[PDB]
Amino acid sequence: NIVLTQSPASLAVSLGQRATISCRASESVDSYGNSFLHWYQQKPGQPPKLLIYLASNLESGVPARFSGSGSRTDFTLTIDPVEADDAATYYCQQNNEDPFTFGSGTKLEIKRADAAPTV
Amino acid sequence: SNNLDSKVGGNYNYLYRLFRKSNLKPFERDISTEIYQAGSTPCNGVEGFNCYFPLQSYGFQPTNGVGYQPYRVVVLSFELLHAPATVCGPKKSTNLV
């Protein structure tokens, strides 16, 4: 049981900024040609979707703001620029070692423009 | 060959070898044609739960660029022996003198 300490826990960001989502892990490395993990986006009122698998291959359905890199053990998810679709929790999936544990989660909030309620 | 070999999701069946222990002879085929796994249990197709190929794979996607799509390359080799020539072409069309 590897507790993937994901930092930060919760942070409200605004539009046009750069959020730093770090995933701490140790296992594993060198699957077939790389040593990266999977990234996801879990919304509290919507089923999640896969952003990018193995951090080196193309996949449709993801916005272009999700990118980044990382080392063999630690990884970093960079959201730049922050749009108004980041009100969700992000995790990292261990894909090589049993049990396939996950991160702690970074609950990001959107500081968008002001809006009036419906009357 | 994007409409012939590639499919939805990417075709990762074509790979290449980084380094070979033995030396290669001219007109010799590699007998190691079986796709091995990372462990002991074979996967028989797609990868998962530590059955990866140690050889490096190519990126063959249907939405890829024109310089990265799978291209079927056929090398037309030529040789000459003590036997007379048999294969020749083309020679158009129907002349006689």
Binding site: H38, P47, L50, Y53 | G48
Partner: peptide
């Protein structure tokens, strides 16, 4: 919590979702 189900993908990931 709100549980979800997913199928295994090609590169050992959760590609399919409901």
């Amino acid at each position: 919590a709100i549980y979800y189900c997913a199928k295994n993908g090609g590169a050992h990931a959760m590609d399919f979702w409901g």
